[PDB]
Amino acid sequence: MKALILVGGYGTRLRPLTLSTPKPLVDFCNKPILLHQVEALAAAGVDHVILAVSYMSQVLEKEMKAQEQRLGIRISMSHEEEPLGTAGPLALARDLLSETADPFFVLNSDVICDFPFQAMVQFHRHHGQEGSILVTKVEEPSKYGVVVCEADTGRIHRFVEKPQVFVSNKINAGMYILSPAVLQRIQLQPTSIEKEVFPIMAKEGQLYAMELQGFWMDIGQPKDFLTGMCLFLQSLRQKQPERLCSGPGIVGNVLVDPSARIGQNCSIGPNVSLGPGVVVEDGVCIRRCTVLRDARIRSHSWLESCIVGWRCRVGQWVRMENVTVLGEDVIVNDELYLNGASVLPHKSIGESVPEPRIIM
Amino acid sequence: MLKAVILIGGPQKGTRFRPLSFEVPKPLFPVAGVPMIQHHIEACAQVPGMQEILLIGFYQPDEPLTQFLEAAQQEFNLPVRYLQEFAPLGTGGGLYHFRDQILAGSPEAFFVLNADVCSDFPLSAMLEAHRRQRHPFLLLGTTANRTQSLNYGCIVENPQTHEVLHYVEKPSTFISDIINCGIYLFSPEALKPLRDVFQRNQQGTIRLEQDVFSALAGQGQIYVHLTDGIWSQIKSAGSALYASRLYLSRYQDTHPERLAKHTPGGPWIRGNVYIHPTAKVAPSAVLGPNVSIGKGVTVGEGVRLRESIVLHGATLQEHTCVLHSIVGWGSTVGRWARVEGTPSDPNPNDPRARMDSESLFKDGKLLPAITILGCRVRIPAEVLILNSIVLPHKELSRSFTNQIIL
Amino acid sequence: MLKAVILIGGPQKGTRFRPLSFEVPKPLFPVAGVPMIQHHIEACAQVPGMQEILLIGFYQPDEPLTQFLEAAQQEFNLPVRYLQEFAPLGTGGGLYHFRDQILAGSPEAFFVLNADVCSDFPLSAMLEAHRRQRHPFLLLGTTANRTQSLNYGCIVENPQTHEVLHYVEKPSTFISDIINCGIYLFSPEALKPLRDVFQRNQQGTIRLEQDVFSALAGQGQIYVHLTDGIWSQIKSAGSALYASRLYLSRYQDTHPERLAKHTPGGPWIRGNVYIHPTAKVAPSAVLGPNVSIGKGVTVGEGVRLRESIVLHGATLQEHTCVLHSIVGWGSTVGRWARVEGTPSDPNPNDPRARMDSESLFKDGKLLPAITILGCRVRIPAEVLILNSIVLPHKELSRSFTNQIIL
Ligand SMILES: Nc1nc2c(ncn2[C@@H]2O[C@H](COP(=O)(O)OP(=O)(O)O[C@H]3O[C@H](CO)[C@@H](O)[C@H](O)[C@@H]3O)[C@@H](O)[C@H]2O)c(=O)[nH]1
Ligand SMILES: Nc1nc2c(ncn2[C@@H]2O[C@H](COP(=O)(O)OP(=O)(O)O[C@H]3O[C@H](CO)[C@@H](O)[C@H](O)[C@@H]3O)[C@@H](O)[C@H]2O)c(=O)[nH]1
Ligand SMILES: Nc1nc2c(ncn2[C@@H]2O[C@H](COP(=O)(O)OP(=O)(O)O[C@H]3O[C@H](CO)[C@@H](O)[C@H](O)[C@@H]3O)[C@@H](O)[C@H]2O)c(=O)[nH]1
DSSP: OEEEEEOOOSSSSSHHHHTTSOGGGSBSSSSBHHHHHHHHHHHHTOSEEEEEESSOOHHHHHHHHHHHHHHTSOEEEEEOSSOOTTTHHHHHTHHHHHSSOOOEEEEESSEESOOOHHHHHHHHHHHOSSEEEEEEEOSOTTSSOEEEOOSSSOBOOEEESSOSSOOOSEEEEEEEEEOGGGTTTSOSSOOOTTTTHHHHHHHHTOEEEEEOOSOOEEOOSTTHHHHHHHHHHHHHHHHOTTTSOOOSSBOSSEEEOTTOEEOSSOOBOSSEEEOTTOEEOTTOEEESOEEOTTOEEOSSOEEESOEEOTTOEEOTTOEEESSOBOOTTOEEOSSOEEESOOBOSSOEEOSOBSSOOOBO | OEEEEEEOOOHHHHOOSSOSOSSSOGGGSEETTEEHHHHHHHHHHTSTTEEEEEEEOOOOOOHHHHHHHHHHHHHHTSOEEEEOOSSOOOTTHHHHHTHHHHHTTOOSEEEEEETTEEEOOOHHHHHHHHHHHOOSEEEEEEEOOTTGGGTSEEEEEETTTTEEEEEEESOSSOOOSEEEEEEEEEOGGGHHHHHHHHHHHHOOOOOIIIIIITTSTTTTOEEEEEOOSOEEEOOSHHHHHHHHHHHHHHHHHHOTTTBOOOOTTSOEEOSOEEOOSSOEEOTTOEEOSSEEEOTTOEEOTTOEEESOEEOTTOEEOTTOEEESEEEOTTOEEOTTOEEEOOOOOOOSSOSSOOOOOOOSBSSSSBOOOOEEEOTTOEEOTTOEEESOEEOSSOBOOSOEESOEEO | OEEEEEEOOOTTGGGTTHHHHTSSOGGGSEETTEEHHHHHHHHHHTSTTEEEEEEEEOOOOOHHHHHHHHHHHHHHTSOEEEEEOSSOOHHHHHHHHTHHHHSTTOOSEEEEEESSEEEOOOHHHHHHHHHHHOOSEEEEEEEOOTTTGGGSOEEEEETTTTEEEEEESSOSSOOOSEEEEEEEEEOGGGHHHHHHHHHHHHOOOOOIIIIIIHHHTTTTSEEEEEOOSOEEEOOSTTHHHHHHHHHHHHHHHHOTTTBOOOOTTSOEEOSOEEEOTTOEEOTTOEEOSSEEEOTTOEEOTTOEEESOEEOTTOEEOTTOEEESEEEOTTOEEOTTOEEEOOOOOOOSSOSSSOOOOSOOBSSSSBOSOOEEEOTTOEEOSSOEEESOEEOTTOBOOSOEESOEEO
């Protein structure tokens, strides 16, 4: 049993957070985004996980080895020297996955959902064909790749990577199980696996589909970060309601780290996650915001649907709304209103912004 | 024996949401290479026993229209005539006024086709259902979105007997999803109820949908034949471009010799592209999907054309990019010049989205849509035209953005 | 002996002035009752010793142009001839190309007048300075505002010697406060620099401002002469109203019989109002300031007109209010219909005025300007046309606000 995790791209994602820490490492409900997936892979029982990274990082290798014996499972990573698309990681890691004949998971870096892997491997063994794909019913399917399926067997009749015509409602959930025979199909030259090999495999009929149960969300967008965290808080409340804190001054689904310290008569609204080491003063109302680690917010401030970066000092009487992302080491002055401002790191702000624009 | 009546409009009744052409008639506008009513004429000539084709509309007979009639008569070996109303008599008034010319010869039934629709034209299927039941009115019907249905004429039917129980014309509220497609089949008895409507007007102009269809609905006189194929209405410029895309995709099943092949020695072609034989395209040019080129067009070295329509005699010089734009005839685009438009299109998440058309101004703001270049418009070198409507015989000198250039 | 050369444009130079211009060339547009070049011809005929007037343009001769020439010859007792360039030769290429027709008779000096300018035309005072200096180029100039001067040709002069030290044509940044009026006085030796430019172009179009005036400046060839009288240029359709206001205020010193008196038996009149003798005005109507009425115009009973030009053949029914608009030839306005516009004039001296742009749209919305109605536009009763441009032969059904009706 092996598993591949698809990292890279360096941009288009949650950029003010991605400038100081890589994308799979940024925290998401007090855990990194990669760490959720590899913990779920530990739950699945895979012996070995490889991750393809398009640029080498010191602190990522640091974090993954220091996590990697706490997990007790070795995890290796492969560096590509040109971005060979999303298919190139399969061909570069071919022999490492191909010395034994056992089907392997391929996971995107940004997908977070309920992880069905133990049921999905028995589905893969039962249907017996080459490639299995998780699919989910979504409301806006133009952004994602769209598959049509069968009634009972789940054979994928057609796969389109970008629809633009409404051929179906169900999308690629983003979780693949690939046989070793698919490794020899793809060449080392840069291709796209979601576009190229799944379409020819669909008209062959080796591709099969499986319906995910709940609360799938893509966390690539900086806007979709907040509603994905909002959905994950509700699903974790349904599964483990003890882990969410309950208090007289906090309402809704609140997930507080043990290292976080909160003042009194401050009203934390629904779907708020506080990182480790944050300090909230008295009289801060926070609704639908995530707060990353080491960040201190001053008193009497209102924050709706905001992302606060690490070691981020926020002034007194500060209002922030409309997916405003704060970055690495931002010092917002007192009595400022930020509507829609994503902030470049290591920058202090002196002017309240009426309209949403990137503050460099 | 059957003839077919095509209701081409008049000049005032077009009232274009974006003017696709300022100088040629709307029914002679080339959609996917051939004029707009030539699709109707060809699909009517394929039907067996088609004796004649009539065009009713109050255009004055300019020489382009009569020259098109010269060409079409000897192309399809059918007599194609033009009957001009003396005044704008409405949709069904021109049918009643010219009843002696249509009824002569005693046709078994006769088609009525709107000129502005772009459709599959399943005239044989409608003819088989009509030969089965011989009812006076047969209507083509299509399935539409709940929001988009308020623009067309909604039809409530009995699902078993396929008879209209209720008809309403552009309703303010949602009524039904089936919409009238502007294609009808008329038995010779069906000119009798029209006459009745005429007498009520004396106590001239008969609107066919509001006075005949919306009054006689439910009384066993109107039957709807549902259909499946492609359907759009050519109201605006963007809907003309989308209808041209629909016809270029339809061309694979009927005329594979019309679409340009890949041709690795010549110019690059991706997607469905119509190139005229007289047009000379340089081999370095690459023509993207859904592109029609007219007769006598000299597409230069290095041109990129995507989602465009180039009328006859236009010249594009080197390294120009033309995206989502209608280029009028005789127009010249200088080198490194870019003509761009915005494809409003249809929603990709909606199951049955029908691509609405909007009349040039959303709520007092000009909205971005297909760039129109008028006839004999000279775009100078290294200049950008974006989301603009350029009137004819105008030579620009600077870049224009989101403007109607008078 | 002196003659005058009036550079009228061609059909391409009148496209900026296009909505009104479909019916008649831009130089034959009636500004303050008479055609636009007729002011130039009349002010040249008022000069003593004017032998001939030549109009140089590339308009094709039709009945409006030659009918104007036949009228103006017998009106001013002067031969008015039209020389037609074979191609658009620029501002100075037409002057050089017809040099034998200009120098025929050996005149002592000849005036050169742009056709688009509305000005005082103080040609006599320029002549009295030219007889003092006898120099090749004399330029009428006027002071303008610091932000408005960038669109006109700027002249940096020495105040003591009255000589163009420097000339920059439509500069990006501020150069000088005086602008070129577009009225010049040419010696017969002034065709010697132009010839040199022609030779330089071969080793045949010559632009007068960009080639002759820019290189010749500062070398003793070009001299300035400053006027303080009224000056404006008619480059767009809404600038004709402002130039008509300037001419109607100029009319008191030159033609006191042209402006209508108050006439307490007849219609109430405030400000300067020109009424043609053929025009039928109801006595209940009141006409505000700066209003011109064409020939054969019927104005209804109770009508208000302020700052508006009503062209000839137009019909205003009763109880209507027309502010800031140009009502085209044969246009009809139904009862209780308001046609409004917002004031906007070149006004070079003023800082508030929006300066020349071909754009007409700021960010997808029409800028507030003068309402134009083209030829034969039928406005229905009880309907508002505000800030809107209506193309010719278009009948409207409902009230349009801030739109261009195509
Ligand atoms: N090494 C490497 N990895 C890459 C590269 N490009 C993308 N990846 C990884 O491949 C995954 C997909 O990249 P996206 O570009 O974000 O794809 P998408 O627009 O989100 O759509 C994909 O995911 C959807 C589900 O989230 C699918 O529905 C859709 O079909 C498609 O697979 C991401 O985790 C990204 O890290 C690359 O060039 N090199
Ligand atoms: N002879 C004549 N023909 C006319 C006249 N007015 C319109 N026509 C032609 O009749 C056809 C439809 O006329 P419209 O009145 O503009 O109908 P519509 O708003 O476009 O909608 C109609 O067609 C839709 C599909 O295109 C239908 O869905 C809808 O029910 C309705 O029938 C067009 O081709 C138009 O050119 C006229 O006065 N005289
Ligand atoms: N014969 C001929 N006449 C022409 C041609 N082109 C223009 N004219 C006439 O020449 C005059 C000005 O031509 P433009 O090229 O449009 O100049 P402009 O933008 O109006 O600016 C000129 O006049 C301004 C005052 O009106 C000046 O301020 C400016 O510096 C410049 O001289 C107008 O009467 C125009 O009709 C031509 O090609 N041939």
